[PDB]
Amino acid sequence: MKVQYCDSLVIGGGLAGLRAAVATQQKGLSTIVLSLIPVKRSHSAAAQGGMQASLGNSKMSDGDNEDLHFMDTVKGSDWGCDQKVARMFVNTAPKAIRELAAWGVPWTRIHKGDRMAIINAQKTTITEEDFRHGLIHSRDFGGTKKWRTCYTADATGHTMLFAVANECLKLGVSIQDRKEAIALIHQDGKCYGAVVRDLVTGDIIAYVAKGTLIATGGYGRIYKNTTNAVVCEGTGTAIALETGIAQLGNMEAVQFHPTPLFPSGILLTEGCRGDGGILRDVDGHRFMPDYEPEKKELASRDVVSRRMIEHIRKGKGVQSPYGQHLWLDISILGRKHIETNLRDVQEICEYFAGIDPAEKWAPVLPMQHYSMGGIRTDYRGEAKLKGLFSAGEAACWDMHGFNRLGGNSVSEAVVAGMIVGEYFAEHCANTQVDLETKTLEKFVKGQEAYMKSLVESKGTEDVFKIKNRMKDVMDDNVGIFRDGPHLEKAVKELEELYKKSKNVGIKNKRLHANPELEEAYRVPMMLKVALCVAKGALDRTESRGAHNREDYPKRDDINWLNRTLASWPNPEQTLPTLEYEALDVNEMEIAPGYRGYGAKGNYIENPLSVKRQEEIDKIQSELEAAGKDRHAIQEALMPYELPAKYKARNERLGD
Amino acid sequence: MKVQYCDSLVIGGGLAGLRAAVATQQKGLSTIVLSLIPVKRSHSAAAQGGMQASLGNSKMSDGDNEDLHFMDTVKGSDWGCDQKVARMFVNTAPKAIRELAAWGVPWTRIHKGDRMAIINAQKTTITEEDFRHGLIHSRDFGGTKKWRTCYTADATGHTMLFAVANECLKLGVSIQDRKEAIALIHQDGKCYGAVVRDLVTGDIIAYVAKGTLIATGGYGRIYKNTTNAVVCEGTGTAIALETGIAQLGNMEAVQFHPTPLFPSGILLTEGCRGDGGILRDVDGHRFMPDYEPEKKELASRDVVSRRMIEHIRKGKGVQSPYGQHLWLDISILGRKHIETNLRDVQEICEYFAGIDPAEKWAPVLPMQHYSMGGIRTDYRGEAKLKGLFSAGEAACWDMHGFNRLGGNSVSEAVVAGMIVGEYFAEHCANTQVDLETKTLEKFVKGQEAYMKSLVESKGTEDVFKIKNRMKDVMDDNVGIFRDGPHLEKAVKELEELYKKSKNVGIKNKRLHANPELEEAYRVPMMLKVALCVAKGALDRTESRGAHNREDYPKRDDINWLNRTLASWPNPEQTLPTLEYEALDVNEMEIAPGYRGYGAKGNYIENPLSVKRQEEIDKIQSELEAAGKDRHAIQEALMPYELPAKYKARNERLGD
Numbered sequence A, B: 001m002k003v004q005y006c007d008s009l010v011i012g013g014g015l016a017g018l019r020a021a022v023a024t025q026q027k028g029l030s031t032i033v034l035s036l037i038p039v040k041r042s043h044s045a046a047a048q049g050g051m052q053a054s055l056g057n058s059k060m061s062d063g064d065n066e067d068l069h070f071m072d073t074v075k076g077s078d079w080g081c082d083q084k085v086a087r088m089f090v091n092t093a094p095k096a097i098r099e100l101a102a103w104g105v106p107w108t109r110i111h112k113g114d115r116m117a118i119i120n121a122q123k124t125t126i127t128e129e130d131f132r133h134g135l136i137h138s139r140d141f142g143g144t145k146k147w148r149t150c151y152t153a154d155a156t157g158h159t160m161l162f163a164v165a166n167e168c169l170k171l172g173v174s175i176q177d178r179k180e181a182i183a184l185i186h187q188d189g190k191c192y193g194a195v196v197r198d199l200v201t202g203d204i205i206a207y208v209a210k211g212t213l214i215a216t217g218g219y220g221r222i223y224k225n226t227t228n229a230v231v232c233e234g235t236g237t238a239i240a241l242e243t244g245i246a247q248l249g250n251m252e253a254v255q256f257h258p259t260p261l262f263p264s265g266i267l268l269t270e271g272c273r274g275d276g277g278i279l280r281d282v283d284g285h286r287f288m289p290d291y292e293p294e295k296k297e298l299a300s301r302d303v304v305s306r307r308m309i310e311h312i313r314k315g316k317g318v319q320s321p322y323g324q325h326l327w328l329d330i331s332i333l334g335r336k337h338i339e340t341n342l343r344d345v346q347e348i349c350e351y352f353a354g355i356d357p358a359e360k361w362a363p364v365l366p367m368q369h370y371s372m373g374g375i376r377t378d379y380r381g382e383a384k385l386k387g388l389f390s391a392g393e394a395a396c397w398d399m400h401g402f403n404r405l406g407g408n409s410v411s412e413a414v415v416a417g418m419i420v421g422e423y424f425a426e427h428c429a430n431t432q433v434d435l436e437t438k439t440l441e442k443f444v445k446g447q448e449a450y451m452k453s454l455v456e457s458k459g460t461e462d463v464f465k466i467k468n469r470m471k472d473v474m475d476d477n478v479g480i481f482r483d484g485p486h487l488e489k490a491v492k493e494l495e496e497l498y499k500k501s502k503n504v505g506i507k508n509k510r511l512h513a514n515p516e517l518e519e520a521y522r523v524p525m526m527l528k529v530a531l532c533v534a535k536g537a538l539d540r541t542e543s544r545g546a547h548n549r550e551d552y553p554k555r556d557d558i559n560w561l562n563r564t565l566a567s568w569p570n571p572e573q574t575l576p577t578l579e580y581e582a583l584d585v586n587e588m589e590i591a592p593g594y595r596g597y598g599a600k601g602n603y604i605e606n607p608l609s610v611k612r613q614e615e616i617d618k619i620q621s622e623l624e625a626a627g628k629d630r631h632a633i634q635e636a637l638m639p640y641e642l643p644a645k646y647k648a649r650n651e652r653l654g655d
C-alpha cells in the first residue's frame, strides 16, 4: 500500500487553494497540494474584470469603505447570505490586495491628470488629483455605486495566480499536478485525508494529514453552455457529498453572465460596460434604462441577463444556425480604451468571432459563469465533517447568497485563503488524530476495486452520450427562468441517468493515463451534484436573486429566508436529502428590503424584518448623537469575528 | 513535521536486513531500508572463509546432512543455545545456498579429478569422482568434522551481499543510505517505526510502518581491537534497549578470532588452516596437538585462542613496539592454494604487513570478531516489544549460544532473512496499528530537542577521549580471560563514563553533515551496550564457551543453563537490569555433555542432563528397531516449527 503523509493536505491548487497553503507552510506545517493540471493553469488565470476591494484611492474609489462595500455586497446578495462573513471579508480584501501588490502583482495604477471617461451617456473628462499618483487604480463594475474594482489590464486573474503560486514555490510548498482526489477518508465523522489517483501512472495513493482543505472550484460544467474551463466539473464538490456527512449549500444558486461571446461561451468582460461600453438589442438601441432605468448594464447578473431572454422570447431573437442572440457595441469607447484594458476581450473576438471589437458589436448571449453553492461550511471554514475545510467558488462559506457581486469571487479567493487559512493552520497544529491502518486500507483497497470493476465493466453505455445528455437537461430546464413542470422532467431524467451511469463500458482497458476511464468515474459524481441543484431548485418555491421561478416570482421572506442544505446520507439513494437552515434577522446589520435595483416591490415581506429595521435606526441615531464612529455602531448592530493577524483596520487615503 | 510511511521498515541494509526486505517486497508490502552507508559496503562484504551449509556434494561434504550439521552446531554452542532454532536453520541453509547460486553468486565448484590436499600433516592427494563435477564445492573449516563450508575464493561474503542487494534493486525496494535510526517509536509496548536522522541534511524524520526489523550488525567496536568495520558500533542494538521493553541476550557472549593480522586487526581467514596452513609458536613449532591433540587449529574460537594467550602469559610473547604475538605459516600450502582462495589474505599481508604470505608467517594475535548477543527475540523473530523483529549478528535469535561455529554467521544471515522474513511479512500484512499524531510528534519533537541540547551543550568532555577510553577498558578486563576483580573495576569505570558522556562539548555547531555531533549521540549508546556486556559477564559466574572465567572454570549446568536477558527499564538508571531465562533439557535433541574437544571433563554436571540422555537413547534404539528414518526420530526427540515455503526437505546427492 502506498501512503503519503503531510501536516496539511490542500485538494485544489486553484487561486484560493494556494493562498491557504501559503499561510500554513509559512508556519512549519508540511503541506501538499494536489491538482488536476499544473496550478498556474487553473481557472483563475482566466479572470477578466478585476478584484473588488473597498480601497478608495481613485477619484472614484473615493470615500469608499468597508460599510459601503459591505452594503453593496449584502444588497446584491438579495439577502440570502451570512452577514457576519460578508463582514469579515470586506474588512480584509483591502489588506489582501495590498499584500498581492507587494508580492509582485503589477496593478494598473493612477496617473496625475485629466482622464476621458465614458460613463453611460458619453465622454465626461474626469480628473484625478495629484495625491493619488501611483496608487492602485479602479474600474466601474457590475452593480457598484463606487469604483472599487481593481485591475492589471483585463487579464487580472492571471498576474495574481502567478504572484501567489510563485510564492508557494519560494516557501517549499509541494505541488503535485496530474493527481486527482476521488474520495475523502473519514472515521467517526472526522476527515483524515483523501484517496488520490495519479492521473498518469494510474495508481491509487492514500494521502493522510491532520487537516484537509477542498478548493475544487465551481461546477459550471454540469451545464452545456458555461464560461468555466473544462476542468471545472465539480468532482471536488462531489466527493465531500459522497461522505454523506457534510452538506452542500444553495446548490441551486447558479450565477449567469450576460455577455459571453456566443456560441463558444468564451468570456467577454464586464469592463466592457464599466468602461462605458453598452448593450445593443436586435433592433439595435438600448433595452438599457428601457427595461430598467438605473442602467440595465451596471446591474447584477440575475438582472442584466433576465430580460436578455425576454426580448428573445418575444420572438425578437435574430439567430443563426446555433441560436438567437444580441450584440455589445464598444466601438464607441475609444480604440485605446479597447486596444488596452479590453486587450484580451478584443483578441478573443478576432481569433474566434473572426471580427474586430473597436469596430462592431459581438454575437453574445447569457450562459452559466459562477457557482455560489458548494460544500457548506461554518464561518471559520470547517464543515460538518470536523477536519474538512473549504474555500473558493468551490464551497459555500456564503458571503454570496443568491447573487455574487462582480469582482468579488477573486477577492473571496485570496481573502478566504487568508482567513480560512489561519483557522486551518490552527486546526492542523492542534487537533490530534487517530490514524488506523485498517481504515486506511479499507478506503484504498476499496477504491482500487472500484477502478477494476470499471475496466472489467460489460455494460454498454457511452459515457460521452450520458455526459453530454446531462449538460443538455441542465442548460434547458434549469436555465435563467425555471418553472415547476420543467424542474420535474429534469430532476427525473437526471436521476434516470445516475442509474444508467453505473452501466457504462469503456473501450481502452489500460489502467494508466487513461482519459476514457477518467470520464467514467467522473460522470456519476457530476450527476449527483446535478441532482442537488435541479432538485435543490425545484423545492425552493420562490424567486430570489439568481433563482427566477416564473411561477413563484416573489422573494418570499416569511418562508424562504433559509439555505438549501443538501446532503446524501446513504450510498444507495438516487436523490439528495434536502434539509433547510433558517436565517436570523436579529443578527443582520441590514434588514430585508429593496436591493437598490431589480423589479421594485416584489418581495412578500416578513414582520421581524421591519421590527429589526426600526431598532437598527434606533441604535443608529442614538450612537450618532452620542458621537460614535462607524466602527462603534457596526459593533453595535452586529459584531463579527476575525483572526488575530487580520484584526487591525485598513488605513485609507485621507484620515 | 516530516513523516514517511511504508508497510514494513528495515533498519539495517546489511546482508540479513536485505534478504528480509526481499521476502516482503516480493509480496506487495511497500518496504524501506535505512542504512548508515550504501548497502553493498556493509560489513558482510568483508566475509572471508565462507558459508556453511549441510550440502554434501564434495567428496568431503559427502554424507553430510542436517543432523550432522545440527550436532556440529549444538556441540559448538557449548549448550547455551535454542535447539529448535538451530534446527530450523540447518534445514534451510542448503536451500538458501542454492537460491543464492541461482541469483548469480558464482560458487567455486568441483572439478573431475585428483586434488592436492594438505590436511594437518601434509599432501594427501584427494580424488573427486565424476558425478560431482560442477556442484558447489566446500572447504574444511573451524571445528567441523565434515567439509560443508562453501566458497567463492576467499571473498565469499562479497559475491553474496551483491547478489542479494542487486535483487532488491530488481524488485523496487527502497534503499536510503546516509540515514540513521536513533530511537524506536512505541506506544503501549508496540513498535510503530523509528525516528531517523538524515546524516547529511541533518534533519529528523519519523519513519512509521506496521512492522519494523532491526539488523544493525555486531557491536565489536565497543572493543579497541576488533576485526569489525568502523560502523559496527551497535547503535542499533542500543536503541532497542533504550525503549526499556525489549531485552538483549547473552550480551557478554563475545567471540574472539585467533589470527587477525596484528596489530591492524584486519582479518586473515580460517581457510588458512582449513586449507592446511598452520600456526607457528614463538619458539616456532606447533603448540597445535601440543596443547590439544585433535588439532589446536580446526577447533572453536574460544579454543584455538585461549592458549594463544597462555604461551604469551608465560612471558614467551616475542613482541614489538605494540605487543607480543605469534605467526601463521602457510608458506607450505602451495603458491596456487595461496595466490588463489587465500587471494585477499595475501594482498592484505603485502599492503599492510609489508611482507609476502606464500613466503612467511604473519604477526597475528586474537582479537574480537563476532557478537553472539543482541536484541533477544523468540523463535519466529519478534521480540518482547511486539512488532519489532530482528535478525543477523545484530540480534540474539540464538542458534549460537556461547560460541558461533565458523561459517555459520553468514548462513544465519540469509537463512534468518528467509525465515524471519516470512514471519515479518505475515505480521505486517495482518497486524493493524493505531498511529497517533500526538505520539508521533512526541517522539520526533522530542528527538529534535535532544540534538539541540547537544549543540548548545557547554560541558567540556572530549567525546573522542571518552570513546577511546571505553574501548581500552573493554579490550583489557573483558578480554578472552575474565576474572571477578577485573569485571568490577570495569563495570565501574564504564558507568562512571556513561555519566561523563552527558557532559560532552562539540566544537562544530552546524546541525548537518556533522561528524563530530554524530560521535556525540552515538557514544552514550555504546556505553549502555558496554555496561550490558561487562556487567552481564560479571554476574555470569562460570566458564561456558567463549566466556572464560579464571575463577569459575567449570561449565556449570546446574545453575547456569540460562541466558543473561539484559534490559534497561528506566531512563535514569546507570546499570542494566539483568534477569535470567532457564533452558529446558526435555526439549533438547542433544543433552549436555563433552563438546568433542576443548578441555575434557570440566563441566559440573546436572542430573536431568543424564536422565534426558537415557530416554533419548531409549526412543532412539526403539524407533531404529522399528525401522524409522532420521526425520521420524528427529521428530520424536524434538519437533521444530518452520514456515510453509521452507518446509520440504533438502534433496541431496545420492538418495
Ligand SMILES: *Cc1cc2c(cc1C)nc1c(=O)[nH]c(=O)nc-1n2C[C@H](O)[C@H](O)[C@H](O)COP(=O)(O)OP(=O)(O)OC[C@H]1O[C@@H](n2cnc3c(N)ncnc32)[C@H](O)[C@@H]1O
Residues within 6 Å of the ligand: A011, A012, A013, A014, A015, A016, A017, A034, A035, A036, A037, A039, A042, A043, A044, A045, A046, A047, A048, A049, A050, A051, A157, A179, A180, A181, A182, A215, A216, A217, A218, A227, A228, A229, A231, A232, A235, A236, A267, A369, A370, A391, A392, A393, A394, A406, A407, A408, A409, A410, A411, A413
Ligand atoms: C470561468 C471564469 C471565472 C471567472 C472569470 C471569467 C471566467 C471565464 N472572471 C472573473 C472576474 O473577472 N472576477 C472575479 O472575481 N472572478 C472571476 N471568475 C471566477 C473566479 O476566477 C473563480 O470563482 C475563482 O478563481 C475560484 O477559486 P479557485 O481559484 O480555487 O478555483 P479554480 O480556479 O476553479 O480552480 C480549481 C482548482 O482545483 C483543482 N481541482 C479541481 N477538482 C480537483 C480534484 N478532484 N482533485 C484535485 N484537484 C482538483 C483544479 O485543477 C484547480 O487547480
Ligand SMILES: *Cc1cc2c(cc1C)nc1c(=O)[nH]c(=O)nc-1n2C[C@H](O)[C@H](O)[C@H](O)COP(=O)(O)OP(=O)(O)OC[C@H]1O[C@@H](n2cnc3c(N)ncnc32)[C@H](O)[C@@H]1O
Residues within 6 Å of the ligand: B011, B012, B013, B014, B015, B016, B017, B034, B035, B036, B037, B039, B042, B043, B044, B045, B046, B047, B048, B049, B050, B051, B157, B179, B180, B181, B182, B215, B216, B217, B218, B227, B228, B229, B231, B232, B235, B236, B267, B369, B370, B391, B392, B393, B394, B406, B407, B408, B409, B410, B411, B413
Ligand atoms: C567483521 C568481519 C565479519 C565476518 C568475517 C570477517 C570480518 C572481518 N568473516 C566471516 C566469515 O568468513 N564467515 C561468516 O560466516 N561470517 C563472517 N563474518 C561476520 C558476518 O559477515 C556477519 O556476522 C553478518 O554479515 C552480520 O549480518 P548483517 O549482514 O546484517 O550485518 P552487517 O553486515 O554488520 O551490517 C550492519 C548493517 O546495518 C546498518 N546499520 C547499523 N546501525 C544502523 C543504524 N543505527 N541505523 C541504520 N542502519 C544501521 C549498517 O550500515 C549495515 O548496512
Ligand code: NA
Residues within 6 Å of the ligand: A371, A372, A373, A374, A392, A393, A394, A395, A396, A397, A400
Ligand atoms: Na461560492
Ligand code: NA
Residues within 6 Å of the ligand: B371, B372, B373, B374, B392, B393, B394, B395, B396, B397, B400
Ligand atoms: Na548473534
